[PDB]
């Protein structure tokens, strides 16, 4: 699980 953002 890799999550990038805001």
The two structure tokens encoding residue 4: 């990038």
In sequence order, what DSSP letters do the residues of 1-6 get, joined into one string? ------
The CA distance from 5 to 1, in Å, is: 13
Location of structure tokens 């890799």: 2
Location of structure tokens 């805001």: 6
Resolution, in Å, please?
1.2
């Amino acid at each position: 699980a890799v999550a990038a953002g805001a």
